[PDB]
């Protein structure tokens, strides 16, 4: 094993971190630079990345920190949505200002305590420049809108987003105070166009059940139920396999017949005109539950199933112990209706007003693949946002201002504290600098302008780097939900200190 | 020990299923026209530009030998 | 600092660029072939770049980007896959001087794009757009636009050919984009080119039929996605291997399985079956086809199940798995099923007449030999190219790269009118366009920078009133000659580099 | 040791009447040539099992058909037991051999 | 045959005495800086003490090889003060190197070192206070419960721990008479709730195997009836064919498990409890049909547990279902299913007031990584008490101590003189290198610190103050509330000690040509 001591550690920390930390910035925001993805190992494969999410699985690294800040890259990315590289590069903002402290011999107890402790200079800023947006339907269209489209900006994909961004906050519209992703139903298929993305106020089973069993269910009566009828599960009335002789091959089959005609007038006898199985409908009882109008969905969309039930105002049969007892789903109207080139059943009018279902129709599964996951992070900081209706002043705007505040604590602590905390403020200016660095304008005049604005204090402008010149934070529309760039600002404000954390380092490889 | 020779072996092999006679010469000819034009087509001259009063006098010297 | 990514780029740059140079070697006919040397060891020789990038090739990243650059040309037009490489280097050059000028490159990005919707305007300015609606002006452009091109003897023969394909194909004014998708282009071995013929309901590979109607008309188009071969429990074969007793009563089971299936086939019914290859199946019991065709159904067998997807958007006859799927509901409704084994060899199924989807074209490609055929297949396809080319972007315009010398001055004016840091960027984006018929007219011989810099001021006086004239390869009217061109292999050469570059750009 | 032959008899056993099965392959390409060239002239019955049956025509075509696939299934499914048993057989044989000498 | 010589070995002695050492002196508390081990595997891990590091750390000199040896020792009873051996060791014995440099005898001063132990382990028995009791430990448990859980998984110190952990010790302290052993209290890891949710066990917590909870979840009494055999049909926990002949007798099959259901239940409740272990696993329907039938048997069992819950409850397991006694069922003061986690099933229960010789605090995580880092918290309190239960003595120390005991050596070694004179002085000064060496893991001058008590030692000795481990403003010990058990100290006294007397353990430095070959 390889004991690797503060000296040897903090080196190898940097140069992965930062110098991953670099790729990272290196795309980001919307002129973020592109990197070539390096496949390695296998082909050459070039592919090219406004995301280090990406980044973190190609190449394979063996720096620690970038081997642990993966993590970190994703937990805000997995979690807190939309801020997938804006964490990484943070702690990378750091350790280079930790570089230099180290350099200046200086404790990470020294400097730990500076800027932990500064992170609340930032924090109080921050959680001054969280300013309630969604408080008002307008704004909370507003939030909605300028939340929705911000998430999936830099995510690599903006073409026909603002399709799916209004279909999208108009999903969470309805969540009206309480997010709800079961409320509304994520449909993402490959089909239809580049917009032919429907959002169904209801549940919807993309199913084709044709005309042989109803498509067509008014005042629809949704059974939620497992039942096998040939797994044939619980409260199961037949009998298994055995040969006692010759002729044994009639008993068998004779007994689960019977229970699948019994659990059918069991499914008759809840008066539905809709069956939906999570599991197999057979041939026998899908024809006696077309007998009866009895709609019958067989192996139902499965994470729909319950957002059906949830949604549609039912509840499960408990793998059809119920001959009664289940709750029944109601929605208006179910109709089979083509969205994009399959038959989807269209559960219109469902017992939820929260609800929805999103279809998403991409022209190719590569146009259909990367916005949901992107477009997931911003109903999560939308649902974040419904939670707390914010935003707070982006493009450095909070930035330069939460550096000013603690620029101020680096200047009213400043014991060997905030000497650290000058080097924690400088970071918060630093991402700044990045973002016209991405789009190659001047960092020193408008960073230390927008400074010239955050000095005396400016909380209604920032440096946009589309217009490549200082903008409006009131939400001019790159004023970006007070859930993310809190969030953001968590989890690497951990990391670095936690970096500093290990100076012992124990290899064995 | 070149496609450059191997065409060539091809071109006299062509003319020789017309006819085993001028085969060595149009080789010959050959290396005698690349060696003439390549200097201009060295010089300021196109690769293009030369053959063109090549293939065009190859029609004037038939004019000849048709006459 | 971004500067290894520069590096990198400028890497990137290093590879693309010298490479870009080997086709304008190769642009154009004038433009010389390029021996290659290919893991073989042997010659190939080629005036085509698009190749020339595929045949022998470095996966550097740069490189493996600009197959694509004609790749997308190849697919976007189909034609002037050349000059998208052509096009490429030219900025290249232009780019990294911006960032030797230290241009940020999203900015050298941002700067072009932006100008190239510029360009592409002028460049239509410059443009004569033609009737799609008309066939024999297409027929008569088009064909300038082969007689523009190489290939002619087929093509000629192949124009109406093509062009009523095309025509077939064509049921907008605007003549849409014509897709080449609603056309299957097929050979026959036997015939000449003169065979090759224009077919209304898909010509299908050969026929396969034990009893089974030899043509059979208003065919019902079966498919077959479900298994014709009894279960496989131990073999193939619906019996398990033990001994010879136990295993022939459920022989008797492959035997009535495969049978029903069969009967069910017939019971809802089709008149034609396609049947996918056995290996694009499971497995399919001949037995039962063996009874298939003795239920006296015409059959094909054995054919691309892609094909298939081709067949089933064309005629209409859709997937079908299950007996059920038979009605005539995915059974396309043929109005004459026959493979014709006519004019020497080979025997293709010629549906003639049918219930179809768009209007169905497939061509026969008949020739003198196997050669023959390939000769024709360009020929239309050509053709078929320059004409999805000319419908899809209805503006015509002249070739020889002229309009490359008419539209930098411009934009250089446009860039300095434009002004900004960017200005220089536009400018170096404008200065690109002369370099294609710069290298062009060494590649018919000149000096360009001699003949292009009088181009440029016929282009600068008429915009044009001259051009580089493949023949002539110099100073005269193009339009006089008739080298012509759709805006398509034009504007589909523009974005492909530009954004390519505008990607290299931002890439790291 | 009694594991090398238990695969191998079986092996030997399906391989003969599957082989048997070509020559009536033959012949169930010539049974498609003898009752395919008879119309009912003399009395076709299968044989198909014990009970020799009064019989049709096309009862006596679809079987034939279906008699090929005797030498369809039976000489196929011998292939699989072929090694299928002949991999056992041979594994069995270095194993308790080496073990009774050592 | 590699013969080198002893200084030459003296030095890879010493240059491996070094970064182990180091290792600590910025890793030493929470003012030290974090361990991080990364594997063969390539496994990034955040270790501590010495031991979970050391061993981690592959050893490679005798020296490293010797330290795990010695360094078990420490967390072994203790469970702190693994870290400072390791830093005291090279502290004194690279001085010894440059007194053996000096031309000094490893021979002679290490005697002094031995011998100078005493003096500061007598000086050290001077140090704060002879007692602790039940009420009163418990706040300086609070104190060491504070930083204890104030340090590693969380610095929060969630009372839950920090008294739990001591009553499964004051609850086996007593037990042992005035002893306890860590397989007789147990710090049970299992998620399912965060560290917040936590649990002390009198005994055994199992989750209890239900096939169905419709089918009666019951438990009662206060007992277990232990089996290695069946409360409801056997079965080897595998794969079991269920067959029967005709299309009814799947109903009389059911009677077979509904009758011995109650054969069994009848035989091993009447024997006590109902609840019997059953180390057979079952198939899903018996079971149920016997948690239907009655009184729910637990099934799918480690036959450790089977055992555990036995030696827990002192009495034996069942082996032979034809077998039965109430010894060999459980002894248990409770049994009862309890809602196992947020994520999962009631776990059993077992909590035993009949016999117990063992009680066990349970913990919850809200990740492995946090559960098992307070898994790897808690034994280090667990141990210091159990300093405490036998001798309850602590000792100010971390700055107090050291400085102090080495004073009096310092000055012993004037007192003495000879070889220990330089022997009592660098004995010392190594002492006072851990305080100073806290102040180099924290933010302040390390020299200048140790000058700060120092001075203070010249003011008052053995004082209740000290340096700040926790880096307060305030420089203490009993308001640091940084203390350990006066056994500790003098225990982690006795290893460095011990180690760089080990070093010097007779002759022999010749190999074979093997040594660490």
Known sequence: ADEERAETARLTSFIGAIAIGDLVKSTLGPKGMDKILLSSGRDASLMVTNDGATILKNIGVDNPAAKVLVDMSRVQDDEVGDGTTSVTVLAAELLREAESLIAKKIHPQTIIAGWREATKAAREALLSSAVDHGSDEVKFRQDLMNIAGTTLSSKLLTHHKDHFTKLAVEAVLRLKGSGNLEAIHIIKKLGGSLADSYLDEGFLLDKKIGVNQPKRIENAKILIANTGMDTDKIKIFGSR????????????????????????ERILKHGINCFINRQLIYNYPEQLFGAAGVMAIEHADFAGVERLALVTGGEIASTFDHPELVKLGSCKLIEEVMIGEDKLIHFSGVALGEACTIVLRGATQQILDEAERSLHDALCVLAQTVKDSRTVYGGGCSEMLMA????????????????????????????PTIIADNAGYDSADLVAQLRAAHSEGNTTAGLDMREGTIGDMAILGITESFQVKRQVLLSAAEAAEVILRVDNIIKAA | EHPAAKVLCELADLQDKEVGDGTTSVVIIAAELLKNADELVKQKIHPTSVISGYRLACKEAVRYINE | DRDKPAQIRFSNISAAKAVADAIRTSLGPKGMDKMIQDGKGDVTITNDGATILKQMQVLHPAARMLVELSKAQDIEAGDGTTSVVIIAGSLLDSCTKLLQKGIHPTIISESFQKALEKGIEILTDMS????????????????????SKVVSQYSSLLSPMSVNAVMKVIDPATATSVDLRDIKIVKKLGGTIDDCELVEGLVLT????????????????????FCLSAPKTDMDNQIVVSDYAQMDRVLREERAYILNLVKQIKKTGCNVLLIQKSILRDALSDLALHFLNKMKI????????????????????KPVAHIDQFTADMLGSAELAEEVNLNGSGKLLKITGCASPGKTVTIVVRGSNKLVIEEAERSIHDALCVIRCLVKKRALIAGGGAPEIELALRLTEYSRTLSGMESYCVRAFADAMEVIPSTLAENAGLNPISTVTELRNRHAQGEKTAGINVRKGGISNILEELVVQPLLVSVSALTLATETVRSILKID | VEKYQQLQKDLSKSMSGRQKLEAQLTENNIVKEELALLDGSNVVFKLLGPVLVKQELGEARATVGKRLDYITAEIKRYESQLRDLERQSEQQRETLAQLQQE | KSRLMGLEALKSHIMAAKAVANTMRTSLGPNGLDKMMVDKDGDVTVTNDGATILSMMDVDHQIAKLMVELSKSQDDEIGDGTTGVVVLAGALLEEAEQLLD?????????????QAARVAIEHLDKISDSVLVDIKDTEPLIQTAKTTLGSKVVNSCHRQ?????????????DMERRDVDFELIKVEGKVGGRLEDTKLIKGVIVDKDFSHPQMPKKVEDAKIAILTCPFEPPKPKTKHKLDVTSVEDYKALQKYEKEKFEEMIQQIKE?????????????????????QNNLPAVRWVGGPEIELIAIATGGRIVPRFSELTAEKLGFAGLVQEISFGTTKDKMLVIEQCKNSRAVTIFIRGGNKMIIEEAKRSLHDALCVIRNLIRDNRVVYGGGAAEISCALAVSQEADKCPTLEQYAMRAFADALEVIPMALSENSGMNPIQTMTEVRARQVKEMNPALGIDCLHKGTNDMKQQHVIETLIGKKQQISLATQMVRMILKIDDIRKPGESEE
Request: glycine share 6%.
């Open chain 1, 241 to 264: 396999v055995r040969v006692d002789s010759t002729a044994k091959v009639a008993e068998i089959e004779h007994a689960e017949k019977e229970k699948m005609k019994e659990k059918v």
């Open chain 5, 102 to 114: 000096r031309g000094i005898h490893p021979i002679r001063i290490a005697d002094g070192y031995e």
């Open chain 3, 206 to 225: 050969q026929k396969v039929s034990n009893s089974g109607i030899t043509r059979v008309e208003k065919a019902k188009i079966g498919l077959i996605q």
């Open chain 5, 161 to 173: 721990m920090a008294e739990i952990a001591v009553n499964a010790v004051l609850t086996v302290a």
């Open chain 3, 128 to 147: 004569r757009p033609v009737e799609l609606s008309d066939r024999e002006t297409l027929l008569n452009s088009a064909t300038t636009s082969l007689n």
């Open chain 1, 404 to 431: 000013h505040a603690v620029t101020q604590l680096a200047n009213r602590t400043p014991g060997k504290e905030a000497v650290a905390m000058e080097s924690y403020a400088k970071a918060l200016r630093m991402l």
């Open chain 5, 271 to 291: 024997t006590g409890a109902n609840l019997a272990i059953c180390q057979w696993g079952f198939d899903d329907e018996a079971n149920h049909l016997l948690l």
């Open chain 3, 298 to 317: 015409m059959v094909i067998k054995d054919i691309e199940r892609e094909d298939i997807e081709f067949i089933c958007k064309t005629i209409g006859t």
